[PDB]
Write a protein that binds this ligand. Structure first.
Ligand SMILES: Nc1ncnc2c1ncn2[C@@H]1O[C@H](COP(=O)(O)OP(=O)(O)OP(=O)(O)O)[C@@H](O)[C@H]1O
Ligand SMILES: Nc1ncnc2c1ncn2[C@@H]1O[C@H](COP(=O)(O)OP(=O)(O)O)[C@@H](O)[C@H]1O
Ligand SMILES: [Mg+2]
Lengths: 897, 440
């Protein structure tokens, strides 16, 4: 009702469009007023849903007015339009429209600036007074323009300050990161061109080196926001130093000019009167226009040679308004390359995770959403689309390309004419040759420019990043890390989930970053990070191989967490073996820096118990309330998991995981702000079910819904994967998650008996009965009986480790049932009756799934391997006297009928 | 006998099926375009030109060999019979034996096969007997049928050929890809509109909407003058209905197997330095597409260099030539960008990057005397010529070149053993197929 009143019941000159909708809204207003009066002194929801259907055209026209509303759902659109005067509802959706902006600064009912996701604050050039009668799209459009003008102002006066002769160490504390970055790149390309006019490069190389060392010195003593800014400028300046050093080593001028042509250059026109088109980027001759869109302080990529060649081929594709195509094995840096190219071009690249549910209408709606905005669109995992849909959208993509190339003002897609902004572009990242993925038709492949990035340069990445933390010996450590990873990949068993590419290196670095305060920035920290990342995912002999190579190529308290785990198992009835405690430590240390985890082991090997007792340990240690949502992936279909499009009226219905993500993002009652939320996919990892979450699992942390909704993943939202085997699990989702392999079972037989017995007596004097049944469960006979039970041929083959539960539950039920006649007999009779019941339970739980002769052999061996009461094949207890089945047969004389 | 041959071809592959209406229409065109032997000869060339375009390259050579066979076995003697059969047999690695000396063309074939040249030996019959060939333009122009279909393997598309054909015909193509019900309805509305008022239409990937193709297209083709229908399907895709394919003209599109023919095609499809650069780019594209077919030795995998790479490389060459107007052309930059960005993007391995870098260093040396192939040297343009004179000189120096019989080795600079193995295997397959075909 608040949304309906905001869109129709309060705004004037908005009810002249649809009079029937106005009358329906008035009737609903009268009904809601009557309901509110009755409450103060079911059918309403149905009426609201019925009148929601007529609002689709209104919302489509509203999205046509402001093109960035295409990234919002219908409910989000209702919320953002209905906030006529509150103005705070718009501020929560800026991450959904822009991506790099999380809130709006408000002051005296006027706007002052925006706030980036990384905590950066951008102050607008002129504060805009917000009228009470104004609508959302007008002030949103003028804010979109004002952000670009403010960014240009900061770039201009920062570049003037740098041209005046000051050092960057004082400028980095004044302006936003993008202004410093663009001004530094302009200054660098101007100075490099000046140096290239002559034969001298050593003076500028020394100047850049001293500036880098000064930035590194200032990095340690700076605030966190300034720390991120200096880190990103240091990545850029390391690229500058690398380019200048490569230029200095050129023998002749021709190769120096070629090497300078191959690299991105950031020029500025000195004649244009238009401010926002004054900066153009030149690489290999082609020129692209800077958009001056706000970026914030993103995680800047290390400018590897492969990254520069990818930038060159992306510029070559976009010069003719074609598409950018990146193909290769998973975990090589395709989406990140596209996003870094967009950030260098001063815009936020909007990334879409393709799926089977993306039909022609959904993909075409996304295309008209991004072409009307003018943003850059990345179609991540383009192979996951159906072949029919891929061939069908070829017309739309070719039409977009032709309209961009010929400068057409409008294009017609989805039976409607929409404006086409000249700033838009389309990119695709795809993984060829994977199971369960379609193939692009050639008519569609001719509209994209392919580039292969199979082999990245991990050494340069590791060296630059370790220099960013300021490690004393970066080159040797990076070489040791890369050689160690290569030796681990080449000298281990050829298992399917043994991938040691670049994502594992990034995880090692992200785990080594927060251990500097505990182990010190050096050899100990990097070997501890390598252990904490790679060791949980390795087997048994490969673990010994890992330890041997770690001792070869590398020279070399946790009391509270272990105490918490012990207490959690004590209240849960578990027992700390060496393997169980090792697995708990590995799970904790690997989840500390990885938000997505895969638990792989045999059936009933100890995955659920491991993560449940670790969850209890986290709750004890941190004090945070913890809520967990367990979802079986393959019980539900994809439509019921993620969501479905009601094709009758073209509206969106949420799935289950999407529903959980929405109710944790909405945060109505404040209970999800200071809590951890776990989604456990307790089924098989189907590629078709899990690859729809690739943007969720990687650093994007976003769930690209079909209807354009972009739900971010909060930092306290962690995803588990409990499964049995990875036979069909593709490496794309393997490398995105910290894997925890269970080489052997985490519990012993006797401990499992004790835990099941404790659970059974928790489910219910009793102390004497518990002592007697514990004494009767003698381990010395039980281990040999279980060892002998493996010789029997069992139908429906189950390991004997899993049949303990049936034996203990059956035995406890039998004692509980016959406890009514246990207080009128002596100790020896009680022991004989209980051991007879236990032998019967063990027989029918271990050899109960075998033939009659096998059952007779097993009752023979349980009699020989246990003085006590003998168990015969027909033995039973009747109302408590032992008898046989001979006298229990009743005389049956059937009639004819 | 020819109809039985074509029926066997249709028995091999579903796309190669033949009706009687098309054959009788071709026989009518024989009369439209020693007397009875002259009509028989004209029938042979007319049926070859009409139904060669509906087959791929191996079946093109099979059909050419068996048709030249049937004609010569009719006309010539039994010594000619024995010589041709034993030469096919030694080409098929089934029967080994020298031919009996008599005219002259048999001696030419003996020279061509005793030099271990196999592809040229297969194409000798096509160059000898048949004196005409048909492209897509000749098929579209010389067909009474207003419905056309077009097939190709995966990872190749010939939509640009039809777009060029429509542009040269001053028509208006309208590409409607299939795969969704919205596109099916739009294609129905547009096909009705184009039948009412004229205009061309093209349907892309018709094998992805087989139910609609089986119902609507069947009932439409079964039942204006500036109207044509084009359909594109994949040769390795699912089977298409026989009557609908027999009611439409069938064309199989593939890249031109020749090297010099590819240069001539790319030259005819297009100051003095721009003409020189596009001539060099056409030569380089033909060389790399010729080398691409050799899977194990020319490259490491199977790649596909289409005309989009040629267009992007030509755009880059023009952008370099316009910006760098000081006559100091950055040849090294052009080499690096073509071998790395334009033609090197699809390359996944590293030996293939090395060989494309070697090719780009060979063809873009930027020297006054450049020897791109062992026979032809392309001099640089002078400082006093015009664009038309430069184009005429380049066409003249292109036309005087004669492709050698071993052009897959000398021009590509490859070891001879691999090329001999490839040619021997391909000619053995073709000759074995025509030997099995000619015995029934
Ligand atoms: N340390 C332990 N102490 C006592 N019992 C344990 C211990 N670890 C595991 N178990 C027991 O092992 C049994 C199987 O373990 P768990 O419940 O973790 O299975 P799982 O990994 O979820 O199995 P599946 O993949 O078959 O669903 C449980 O009944 C649990 O009680
Ligand atoms: N210079 C770099 N190049 C490539 N990847 C990098 C670089 N620096 C860091 N990375 C990390 O490598 C990962 C690459 O993921 P990516 O392969 O882009 O995903 P996708 O498989 O969807 O393309 C990212 O998580 C990123 O954090
Ligand atoms: Mg991806």
């Amino acid at each position: 009702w608040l949304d309906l009143y905001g869109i129709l019941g309060e705004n004037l000159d908005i009810q002249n469009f649809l009079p029937l909708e106005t009358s329906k809204f008035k009737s609903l207003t009268s009904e809601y007023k009557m309901i509110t009066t009755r409450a103060f002194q079911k059918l309403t929801i149905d009426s609201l849903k019925m009148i929601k259907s007529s609002l689709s055209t209104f919302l489509e026209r509203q999205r046509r007015q402001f093109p960035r509303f295409y990234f919002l759902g219908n409910d989000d659109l209702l919320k953002i339009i209905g906030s006529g005067k509150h103005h705070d509802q718009v501020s929560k959706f800026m991450k959904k429209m822009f991506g790099s902006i999380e809130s709006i600064i408000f002051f005296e009912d006027s706007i002052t600036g925006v706030r980036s996701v990384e905590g950066e604050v951008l102050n607008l050039n002129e504060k805009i007074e917000l009228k009470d009668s104004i609508q959302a799209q007008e002030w949103l459009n003028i804010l979109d323009t004002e952000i670009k003008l403010s960014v240009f102002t900061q770039f201009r006066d920062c570049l003037g300050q740098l041209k005046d002769g000051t050092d960057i160490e004082v400028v980095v504390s004044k302006y936003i990161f993008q202004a410093i970055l663009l001004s530094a790149q302009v200054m660098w390309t101007e100075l490099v061109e000046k140096c290239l006019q002559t034969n001298e490069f050593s003076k500028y190389w020394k100047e850049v080196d001293m500036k880098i060392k000064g930035l590194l010195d200032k990095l340690n003593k700076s605030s966190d926001n300034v720390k991120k800014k200096i880190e990103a400028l240091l990545v850029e300046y390391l690229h500058f130093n690398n380019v200048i050093g490569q230029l200095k080593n050129c023998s002749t001028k021709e190769e120096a000019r070629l090497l300078w042509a191959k690299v991105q250059k950031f020029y500025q026109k000195n004649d244009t009167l238009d401010d926002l088109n004054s900066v153009f980027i030149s690489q290999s001759g082609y020129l692209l226009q800077y958009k001056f869109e706000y970026i914030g302080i993103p995680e800047r990529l290390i400018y590897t040679p492969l990254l520069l060649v990818g930038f060159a081929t992306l510029t070559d594709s976009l010069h003719q308004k074609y598409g950018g195509c990146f193909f290769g094995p998973a975990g090589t840096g395709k989406t990140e390359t596209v996003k870094a190219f967009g950030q260098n071009l001063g815009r936020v690249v909007v990334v879409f995770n393709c799926d089977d549910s993306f039909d022609y209408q959904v993909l075409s709606r996304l295309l008209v959403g991004i072409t009307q905005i003018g943003a850059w669109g990345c179609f991540d995992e383009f192979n996951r689309l159906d072949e029919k849909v891929l061939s069908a959208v070829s017309a739309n993509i070719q039409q977009i390309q032709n309209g961009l190339q010929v400068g057409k003002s409008h294009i017609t897609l989805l039976e409607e004419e929409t404006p086409l902004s000249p700033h838009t572009a389309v990119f695709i990242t795809l993984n060829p040759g994977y199971n369960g993925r379609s193939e692009l038709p050639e008519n569609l492949k001719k509209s994209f420019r392919e580039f292969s990035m199979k082999s990245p340069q991990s050494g340069t990445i590791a060296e630059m990043i370790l220099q960013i933390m300021g490690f004393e010996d970066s080159k040797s450590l990076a070489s040791k890390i890369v050689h160690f990873l290569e030796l681990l990949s080449s000298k281990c068993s050829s298992m399917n989930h043994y991938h040691f590419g670049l994502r594992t290196l990034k995880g090692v670095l992200r785990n080594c970053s927060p251990l500097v305060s505990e182990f010190g920035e050096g050899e100990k920290t990097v070997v501890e990070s390598l252990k904490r990342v790679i060791l949980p995912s390795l087997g048994d002999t490969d673990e010994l191989v890992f330890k041997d190579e770690l001792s070869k190529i590398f020279d070399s308290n946790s009391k509270a967490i272990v105490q918490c785990l012990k207490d959690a198992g004590q209240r849960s009835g578990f027992s700390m073996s060496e393997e169980f405690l090792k697995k708990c430590m590995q799970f904790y240390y690997m989840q500390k820096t990885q938000q997505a985890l895969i638990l792989v082991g045999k059936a009933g090997c100890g995955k659920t118990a491991t993560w449940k007792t670790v969850i209890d340990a986290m709750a004890i240690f941190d004090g945070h309330a913890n809520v967990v949502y367990v979802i079986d992936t393959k019980v539900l279909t994809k439509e019921s998991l993620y969501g479905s499009m009601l094709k009758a009226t073209l509206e969106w219905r949420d799935g289950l995981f999407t529903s959980i993500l929405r109710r944790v993002n909405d945060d109505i009652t404040g209970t999800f702000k200071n809590s951890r939320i776990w989604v456990v996919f307790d089924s098989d990892l189907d590629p078709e079910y899990v690859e729809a979450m690739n943007s969720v699992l990687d650093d994007n942390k976003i769930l690209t819904l079909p209807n354009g909704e972009r739900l971010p993943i909060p930092p306290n939202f962690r995803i588990l994967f409990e499964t049995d085997n990875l036979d069909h699990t593709t490496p794309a989702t393997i490398t995105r998650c910290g894997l925890l392999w269970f080489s052997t079972d985490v519990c012993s037989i006797s401990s499992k008996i004790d835990h099941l017995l404790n659970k059974s007596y928790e489910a219910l004097e009793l102390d004497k009965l518990k002592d007697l049944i514990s004494d009767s469960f003698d381990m010395a006979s039980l281990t040999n009986i279980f060892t002998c039970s493996n010789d029997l041929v069992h139908i429906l083959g189950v390991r004997t480790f899993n049949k303990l539960e049936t034996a203990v539950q059956l035995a406890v039920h039998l004692i509980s049932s016959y406890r009514q006649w246990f207080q009128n007999l002596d100790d020896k009779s009680l022991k004989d009756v209980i051991t007879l019941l236990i032998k019967r339970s063990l027989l029918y739980a271990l050899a109960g799934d075998s033939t009659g002769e096998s059952q007779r052999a097993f009752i023979q061996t349980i009699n020989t391997y246990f003085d006590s009461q003998e168990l015969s094949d027909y033995s039973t207890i009747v109302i408590l006297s032992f008898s046989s089945f001979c006298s229990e047969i009743p005389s049956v004389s059937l009639e004819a009928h | 006998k020819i109809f039985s041959m074509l029926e066997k071809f249709g028995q091999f592959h579903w796309f190669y099926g033949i009706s009687i209406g098309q054959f009788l229409s071709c026989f009518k065109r024989v009369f439209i375009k020693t007397r009875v032997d002259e009509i028989l000869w004209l029938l042979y060339q007319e049926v070859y030109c009409q139904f060669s375009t509906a087959l791929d390259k191996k079946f093109k050579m099979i059909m050419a060999m068996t048709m030249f066979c049937l004609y010569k076995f009719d006309i010539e003697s039994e010594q000619y019979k024995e010589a041709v059969l034993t030469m096919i047999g030694v080409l098929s690695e089934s029967s080994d034996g020298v031919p009996k000396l008599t005219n002259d063309d048999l001696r030419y074939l003996w020279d061509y096969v005793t030099t271990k040249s196999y592809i040229s030996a297969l194409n000798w019959f096509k160059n000898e007997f048949f004196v005409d060939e048909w492209n897509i333009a000749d098929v579209v122009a010389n067909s009474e049928n207003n419905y056309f279909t077009m097939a190709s393997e995966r990872d190749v598309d010939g939509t640009f050929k039809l777009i060029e054909l429509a542009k040269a015909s001053k028509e208006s193509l309208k590409i409607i890809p299939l795969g969704s019900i919205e596109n099916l309805n739009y294609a129905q509305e547009e096909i009705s509109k184009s039948k009412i008022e004229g205009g061309w239409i093209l349907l892309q990937n018709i094998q992805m909407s087989l139910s609609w193709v089986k119902t609507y297209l069947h009932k439409h083709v079964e039942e204006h003058e500036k109207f044509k229908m084009f359909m594109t399907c994949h040769l390795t895709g699912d089977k298409l209905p026989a009557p609908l394919l027999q009611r439409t003209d069938r064309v199989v599109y593939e890249d031109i197997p020749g090297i010099l023919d590819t240069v001539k095609d790319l030259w005819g499809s297009q100051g003095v330095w721009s003409v020189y650069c596009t001539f060099l780019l056409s030569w380089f594209h033909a060389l790399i597409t010729a080398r691409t077919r050799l899977v194990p030795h020319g490259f490491s995998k199977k790649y596909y260099f289409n005309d989009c790479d040629f267009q992007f490389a030509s755009v880059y060459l023009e952008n370099v030539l316009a910006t760098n107007s000081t006559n100091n052309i950055p040849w090294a930059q052009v080499r690096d960008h073509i071998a790395t960005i334009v033609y090197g993007g699809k390359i996944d391995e590293e030996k293939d990057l090395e060989v494309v870098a070697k090719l780009c260093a060979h063809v873009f040396c930027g020297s006054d005397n450049l020897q791109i192939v062992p026979g032809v040297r392309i001099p640089q343009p002078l400082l006093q010529q015009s664009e038309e004179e430069e184009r005429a000189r380049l066409t003249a120096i292109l036309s005087n070149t004669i492709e050698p019989a071993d052009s897959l080795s000398s021009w590509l600079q490859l070891p001879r053993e691999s090329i001999l193995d490839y040619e021997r295997l391909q000619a053995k397959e073709v000759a074995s197929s025509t030997e099995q075909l000619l015995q029934e």
